């Protein structure tokens, strides 16, 4: 035959490969360490049409490298911070009644303590005020101490591991990070307006850095999120299956009001040598419960359409139902995210409790506040939040909801789904639908009618 | 008639060198050896046999055993940088005998100590209670203190790593290469006629011993000694063995462990009261095997010392007991054995098992520093495990008797001897591409 | 009839850029950590350029940045593996010093007492310890705490190291250059007639002193005077000597080294006592140099302001002691002295010693850091301490009205300040070997 | 030495409101683990705790008797109060008063003040007794 | 509230021979810390109670060593070595771990 083989140094070809994907940023805040190289100011979007691309989420390895430097980042943020080991003592606290309100009867605690000071040999009398989250009894025999009694009481990581406590010169605020690929490498971002969880995308797009995703933290609702272009979507591994997340992705956002209405007071303490402790002060003025408005309007349209895009993949004659969560710890059966250095822990109750036949008002969703916390599912590795003086507002976009499907029902009868939210790589795994990195091959042969040329 | 010189790139020739060795491992919960971020090792490792080339091979002289050493310690002491320190542990404990269901050889070996500790809250102490060997305890003016007080404070190993010695396989990188000597005959130095060339070389168990090769690769054909100068008394003359014979170690102890909340998040596994009678530990060797072998090591110790001439293995010549005692790990704790009943005879010319009493230690001192020191924590249930030993580390003593009676005693304190048991066939080589040789041709001019 | 482009591989052409350069020793621990740095050459000979000119400029570059983050970054790992301090803040029941104290150490000298722990926690001790009056402060016989119990506790200086500045060479790497300066009428910045390339740089004394600059490099001319603007009296000026005055700084105190037992292992060397007699320490230059040197400085200064304007030397304008007083190192022990005596006079157009008192701190933080710091250790015997010279750090005053009296007055703002002066001639370049120019070769096709 | 004093009427009317003054001597109640008790004993019968009073204000008292029994102390003149109402015929009795402690150690290393345990730890002085008569 | 039961009511002993008086209790006294918490008083005739022993075994001070106590759980005795012409009186014990607190039925002593 007439045809020779011929090499071409490169060929566009992709492979899937798993790489370091380094991040970029806009430009103390040490959670990012603002060390990471700064992005262009023009990300060149190149068009890749007459191509299809096989994009499958679940198994992407950019949300398990997000997950896991997110994890670092954290733990470099509090690895400099002051420990607070010292502070596990008997903690002599006792209810507070100064202006309090009826629901809010109980939950914080007017606790007095034994703390060193800069010297070893002298120690101080402080007073702080702690939640009840945050607090057990240590001996609870001796019972029948009169009504108004100072019985004794300790942390929760006591008896787990003395963590450190989050330093205030630093914020939690959700700075935007762009993955980007090195060299030999490439991301393809899949612009379909209609793009589902798993399959070929029909136009797909190369970029050298992803968008602006914002690193949020959340369980049950997203907030803050990428929202869809025309439609809701809802994506699932198995959608048969009901051990599996199902997510879902809002095209409007809901405006949810969070928000402290107490008027708190910050008061540091030389907890030992350079050291200090920013305990709770005094409350100045009433004390009220911190909650969450929500539209009912908005939301109940909000649900329609996920209630409508639910009659798709199932019947749409099965009787759509929402209920709240099954139960557990605080960290999965109630909405946890942090609002301006304060966490909150929601109770969706009243959000999931609503009922779907197929044929301005507000609620207020009741929020706890707890100062302890692992963040990362974590049993030996927590953190301390200061308190933050004066009240606190939030404005979020709650862009899409972690639910949970409750199978075991027979004959397309009461469908019902509860929100859910087991690993934080779920948060992420929807910011992260449209990127797949891959891994180029700039080698490759073919035939031509040539030969080389003996000289 | 005429000659130019040109140039050849990928020659094979190779120069002596030194490099960081990579690391290898299979792909078989921590460990305090290399984990699992190790780069796993090939299935099928490529083994290329090489003709008509003599490599000077030449152990305690190569940087494989050192770099080994340091990687080994640096390991160890990564795996002990997150573990919980054991510094409020200075406190006066008052000890006293135990005496329930003592023996006439353990008398003495464990004293039960009380001490005030301090319990998860900073303003609350606890009254508890663990036994400590007399190893590790002593005398203040009832009142005890651990040795390690008034030095380095001791860093207690974490029960979820483990220390046992899994394989490791040092890979050479890119433009280097690993040569394994493939004689049967070869000594610790000389020039090796059948040199063969390896990616990687074979399974280094990372064991630490003083006195006996425990794990140890044995000889391919007949017992090899191995010496810088065969006719210096010092250089730690060492022997491997052609076939190994079975020691049982164990602990017959029922020993339990019992967690005490010395901190907020830290545990110290203490010892609770030990269940059933009480007992030495001990390592058992058959005679026979162990009479044979130290038969094989007269007869190969005779062609390098001349025939007609007695020779005696002897007890250590004092010292502390880290080198007078086989030290070893077995389980997860560390004995020092009493291993004066084998090296116990004198061979003249022309010619059921062996119980060594063993002693157990909870603060040591694995390596040559006294800044670092490590408590090893008990574990609980009946500690049994059995080994090869396939090697000596003798020491000869000066004397001018004429070449008679040259007693054998064995001794080497320092790891790199049983590290370098392994590593002698092994050597790295640095590959040099470029070579010039000259030929009849010249380059036209265009 | 035109040219065509030809590409040139290897061009000279250079491009200011910043480049972190890497250390280069003699090989002869230190606190600069030598054993962690590649060894410098034998002999790095110097490229002189010819027909070429090159522009510094000083105060810009990142080299002494590199240097000021290098040293920061060497001196806290290198005090890492110190013990720390932490128990040390208690409260200390001071007492003035007996056995003859002098006028000039009146009250500065304090016999502080305080319980301590020994290498058990459950037991006290009582143990006693000299500290300087700088070093403590008083609680509101009275009850004293140390200076630095409020902010950060400082790690004692490991007595195995040594503060012995040793000089230590900055090389660029590859693809890189560090272009120095030859000529010896040399500007703070400008154009160099007399370039030369070196691989690295000569050895650098990393030096911390705040008022005057001691063992540094000399001018091959005359004075010279370096500043950013010398209009602008905001910015320091660098002033560098010709020919060095010596300096005698004596440290009569005999005291003794006590180690206190703090804990396991760790030990705290607290002042013993002064068995000798008790004086204040001094620094003794002779006049005839100092006043030569200081007639050199106005001639080679008055270019700049005129010839019949009037000078005037004043001491420290005021704030704290560590940036009033000049601040060195002699033998582990850190100094403070009061340089009053020497920018003392005044200039107009046309028993030999002077004695300086200084202050003797323990408890020092180097550089502008406030929390992280160290404590020096007292060294035993007479401390003597012989130094040059070689440069001084001015400032001048506001207003400047009738264009007289220029009162000038030491400075000493940062430490970078020091390195300055002796990077002076050197500057960091990257080479670019990519090179267009156009002749008229075109290449031949098939 | 440590000593306590009680004081109070020892005729007492019946459904009239008994109080009870103790006097505390060598040792004050605003010590980090001081605290007064309060048993009274019938002629001829057994003891029996009434009430007890902490350092840090916490108040305890009987089951039987938690309706009838007021405890309260000051630290300016160092003196408890307790007091009884709805007074029945079947309450006289000797009224005495003890002291109990937590016990509490300091540390060598830390100067912090521990324990090992938070209960009484025995009832270590008691107080002479006043005889409280409940009739017409 | 823990009921406490003392055997016997009364022990008429003779002088110089030894007496124990048992004890026992609803529940155990055993704290979470490992401490068993009771106490023995001894009320002699016309003179306010005084304590004995606490925490089982720790005796008072300034106590006689005659007087000594041990058991566990839900059983205590109190052993006396030797009886006195002084130690006649009501003896009466006490428990300690929760409030209230509830003491026994005495157990006179009279010489015989």
């Known amino acids: 035959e007439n045809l020779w083989v011929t090499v071409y140094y490169g060929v566009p070809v992709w492979k899937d490969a798993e790489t370091t994907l380094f991040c970029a940023s806009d430009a103390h805040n040490v959670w990012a360490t603002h060390a990471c190289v700064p992005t262009d100011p023009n990300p060149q979007e190149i068009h890749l049409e007459n191509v299809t691309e096989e994009f499958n989420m679940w198994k992407n390895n950019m949300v398990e490298q997000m997950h896991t430097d997110i994890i670092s980042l954290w733990d470099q943020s509090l690895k400099p911070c002051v420990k607070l080991t010292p502070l596990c003592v008997t903690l002599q606290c006792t209810n507070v009644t100064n202006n309090i309100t009826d629901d809010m009867r109980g939950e914080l605690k007017n606790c007095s303590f034994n703390m060193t000071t800069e010297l070893r040999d002298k120690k101080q009398k402080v007073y702080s005020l702690f939640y009840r989250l945050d607090v057990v009894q240590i001996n609870e025999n001796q019972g029948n101490r009169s009504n108004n009694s100072n019985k004794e009481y300790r942390l929760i990581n006591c008896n787990t591991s003395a963590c450190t406590q989050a330093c205030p010169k630093v914020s939690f605020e959700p700075i935007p990070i762009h993955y980007c690929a090195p060299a030999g490498f490439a991301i393809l971002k899949c612009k379909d307006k209609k793009f589902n969880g798993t399959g070929p995308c029909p136009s797909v797009s190369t970029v050298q850095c992803t968008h602006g995703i914002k690193p949020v933290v959340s369980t049950q609702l997203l907030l803050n999120g990428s929202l869809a272009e025309e439609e809701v979507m809802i994506r699932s591994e198995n959608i048969t299956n009901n051990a599996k997340n199902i997510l879902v992705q809002f095209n409007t956002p809901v405006q949810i009001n969070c928000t402290r209405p107490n008027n708190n007071t910050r008061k540091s303490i030389r907890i030992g040598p350079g050291q200090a402790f920013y305990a709770t002060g005094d409350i100045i003025g009433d004390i009220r419960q911190a909650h969450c408005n929500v539209s009912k309007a908005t939301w109940n349209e909000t649900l329609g359409k996920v209630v409508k895009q639910l009659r798709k993949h199932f019947g749409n004659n099965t009787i759509i139902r929402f209920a709240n969560s099954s139960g557990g710890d605080l960290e999965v059966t109630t909405h946890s995210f942090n609002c301006g250095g304060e966490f909150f822990y929601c109770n969706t109750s009243g959000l999931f409790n609503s009922t779907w036949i197929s044929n301005n008002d507000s609620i207020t969703l009741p929020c706890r506040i707890k100062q302890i916390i692992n963040m990362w599912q974590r049993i030996g590795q927590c953190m301390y939040a200061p308190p933050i003086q004066g009240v606190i507002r939030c404005v979020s976009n709650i862009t899409g909801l972690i639910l949970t499907r409750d199978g075991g029902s027979t004959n397309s009868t009461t469908e019902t789904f509860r929100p859910g939210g087991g690993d934080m790589r779920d948060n992420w795994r929807s910011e992260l639908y449209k990127y797949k990195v891959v891994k180029i091959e700039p080698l490759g042969v073919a035939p031509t009618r040539c030969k080389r040329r003996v000289v | 008639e005429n000659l130019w010189v040109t140039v050849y790139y990928g020659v094979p020739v190779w120069k002596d060198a030194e490099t960081t060795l990579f690391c290898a491992s299979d792909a078989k919960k921590h460990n305090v050896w290399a984990t699992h971020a190790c780069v796993p090792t090939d299935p099928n490792p490529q083994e290329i046999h090489l003709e008509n080339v003599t490599e000077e091979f030449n152990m305690w002289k190569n940087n494989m055993v050192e770099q080994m050493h340091t990687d080994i310690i640096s390991l160890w002491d990564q795996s002990l940088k997150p573990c919980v320190k054991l510094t409020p542990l200075c406190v006066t404990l008052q000890c006293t005998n135990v005496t329930n269901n003592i023996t006439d050889d353990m008398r003495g070996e464990l004293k039960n100590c009380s001490f005030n500790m301090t319990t998860e809250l900073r303003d609350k102490k606890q009254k508890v209670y663990s036994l400590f060997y007399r190893l590790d305890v002593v005398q203040i003016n009832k009142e005890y203190r651990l040795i390690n007080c008034n030095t380095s404070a001791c860093t207690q190993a974490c029960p979820k790593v483990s220390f046992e010695p899994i394989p490791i396989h040092y890979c050479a990188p890119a433009g280097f290469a690993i040569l394994k000597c493939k004689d049967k005959k070869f000594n610790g130095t000389g020039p090796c006629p059948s040199v063969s060339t390896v990616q990687c070389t074979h399974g280094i168990k990372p064991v630490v011993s003083t006195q006996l090769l425990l794990n140890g690769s044995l000889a391919e054909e007949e017992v090899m000694i191995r010496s810088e100068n065969i006719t210096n008394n010092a250089k730690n003359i060492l022997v491997q063995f052609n076939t190994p014979v079975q020691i049982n170690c164990t602990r017959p102890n029922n020993n339990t462990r019992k967690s005490i909340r010395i901190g907020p998040g830290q545990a110290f596994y203490a010892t609770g009261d030990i269940i059933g009678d009480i007992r030495q530990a001990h390592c058992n060797v058959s005679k026979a095997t162990w009479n044979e072998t130290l038969g094989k090591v007269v007869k190969q110790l005779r062609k390098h010392f001349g025939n007609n001439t007695i020779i005696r293995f002897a007890n250590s010549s004092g010292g502390d007991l880290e080198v007078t005692t086989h030290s070893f790990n077995c389980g997860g704790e560390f004995f020092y054995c009493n291993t004066s009943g084998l090296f116990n005879s004198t061979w003249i010319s022309n010619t059921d098992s062996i119980t060594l009493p063993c002693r157990i230690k909870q603060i040591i001192n694995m390596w040559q520093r006294i800044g670092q020191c490590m408590y090893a924590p008990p574990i609980q249930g009946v500690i049994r495990c059995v080994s090869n030993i396939t090697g000596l580390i003798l020491t000869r003593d000066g004397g001018s008797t004429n070449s008679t009676t040259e007693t054998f005693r064995p001794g080497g304190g320092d790891m790199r001897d049983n590290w370098r048991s392994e590593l002698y066939k092994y050597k790295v080589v640095k590959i040099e591409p470029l070579g010039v040789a000259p030929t009849r041709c010249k380059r036209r001019v265009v | 009839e035109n040219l065509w482009v030809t590409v040139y591989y290897g061009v000279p052409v250079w491009k200011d850029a910043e480049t972190t350069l890497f250390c280069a020793s003699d090989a002869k621990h230190n606190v600069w950590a030598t054993h962690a740095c590649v060894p410098t050459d034998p002999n790095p000979q110097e490229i002189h350029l010819e027909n070429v000119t090159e522009e510094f400029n000083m105060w810009k570059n990142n080299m002494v940045e590199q240097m000021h983050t290098d040293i920061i970054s060497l001196w806290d790992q290198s005090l890492k593996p110190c013990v720390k301090l932490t128990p040390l803040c208690v409260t200390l029941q001071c007492t003035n010093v007996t056995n003859n104290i002098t006028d000039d150490m009146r009250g500065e000298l304090k016999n502080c007492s305080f319980n301590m722990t020994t290498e058990l926690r459950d037991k006290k001790q009582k143990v006693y310890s000299l500290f300087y009056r700088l070093d403590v402060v008083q609680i509101n016989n009275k009850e004293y705490r140390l200076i630095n119990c409020n902010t950060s506790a400082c790690t004692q200086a490991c007595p195995k190291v040594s503060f012995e500045p040793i000089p230590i060479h900055y090389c660029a790497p590859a693809g890189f250059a560090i272009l120095k300066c030859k000529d010896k009428k040399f500007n703070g910045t400008g154009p160099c007639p007399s370039v030369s390339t070196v691989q690295c740089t000569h050895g650098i004394k990393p030096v911390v002193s705040t008022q005057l600059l001691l063992n540094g490099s000399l001018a091959e001319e005359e004075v010279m005077i370096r500043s950013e603007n010398i209009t602008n009296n905001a910015k320091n000026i660098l002033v560098q000597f010709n020919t060095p005055v010596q300096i005698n700084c004596t440290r009569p105190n005999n005291n003794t080294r006590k180690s206190i037992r703090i804990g396991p292992g760790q030990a705290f060397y607290a002042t013993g006592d002064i068995i000798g007699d008790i004086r204040q320490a001094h620094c003794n230059v002779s006049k005839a140099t100092w006043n030569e040197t200081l007639g050199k400085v106005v001639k080679q200064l008055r270019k700049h302001f005129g010839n019949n304007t009037i000078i005037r030397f004043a001491n420290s304008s005021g704030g704290d002691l560590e940036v009033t007083t000049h601040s060195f190192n002699c033998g582990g022990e850190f100094f403070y002295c009061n340089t009053s005596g020497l920018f003392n006079s005044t200039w107009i157009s046309n028993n030999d010693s002077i004695t300086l008192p200084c202050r003797i701190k323990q408890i020092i933080n180097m550089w502008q850091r406030i929390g992280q710091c160290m404590y020096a250790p007292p060294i035993q015997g007479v401390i003597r301490c012989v130094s040059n010279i070689t440069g001084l750090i001015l400032t001048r005053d506001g207003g400047s009205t009738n264009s007289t009296t220029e009162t000038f007055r030491p400075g000493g703002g940062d430490m970078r300040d020091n390195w300055r002066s002796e990077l002076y001639k050197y500057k960091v370049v990257k080479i670019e070997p990519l090179g267009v120019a156009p002749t008229r070769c075109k290449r031949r096709v098939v | 030495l440590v000593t306590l004093k009680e004081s109070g009427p020892a005729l007492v009317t019946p459904t009239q409101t008994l109080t009870l003054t103790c006097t505390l001597s060598?040792?004050?109640?605003?010590?980090?683990?001081?605290?007064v008790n309060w048993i009274r004993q019938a002629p001829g019968k057994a003891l029996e705790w009434l009430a007890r009073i902490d350092y840090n204000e916490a108040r305890f008292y009987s089951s039987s008797l938690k309706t009838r029994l007021s405890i309260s102390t000051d630290a300016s003149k160092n003196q408890v109060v307790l007091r009884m109402t709805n007074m029945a015929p079947v309450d006289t009795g000797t009224y005495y008063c003890?002291?109990?402690?937590?016990?509490?150690?300091?540390?060598?290393?830390?100067?912090?003040?521990?324990?090992?345990?938070?209960?009484?730890?025995?009832?270590?002085?008691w107080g002479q007794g006043v005889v409280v008569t409940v009739s017409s | 509230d823990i009921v406490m039961t003392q055997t016997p009511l009364s022990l008429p002993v003779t002088p110089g021979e030894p007496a124990s008086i048992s004890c026992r209790s609803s529940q155990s006294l055993l704290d979470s810390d490992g401490y068993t918490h009771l106490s023995w008083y001894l009320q002699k005739p016309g003179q306010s109670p005084q304590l004995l022993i606490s925490l089982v075994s720790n005796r008072a001070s300034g106590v006689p060593d005659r007087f000594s106590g041990s058991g566990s759980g839900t059983d205590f005795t109190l052993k006396l070595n030797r009886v006195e012409a002084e130690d006649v009186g009501l003896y009466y014990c006490?428990?300690?771990?929760?409030?209230?607190?509830?003491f026994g039925q005495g157990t006179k002593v009279e010489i015989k």
């Open positions: 060598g040792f004050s109640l605003t010590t980090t683990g001081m605290r």
């Open positions: 006490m428990q300690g771990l929760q409030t209230p607190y509830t």
């Open positions: 003890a002291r109990s402690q937590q016990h509490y150690y300091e540390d060598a290393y830390t100067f912090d003040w521990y324990y090992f345990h938070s209960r009484d730890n025995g009832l270590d002085s």
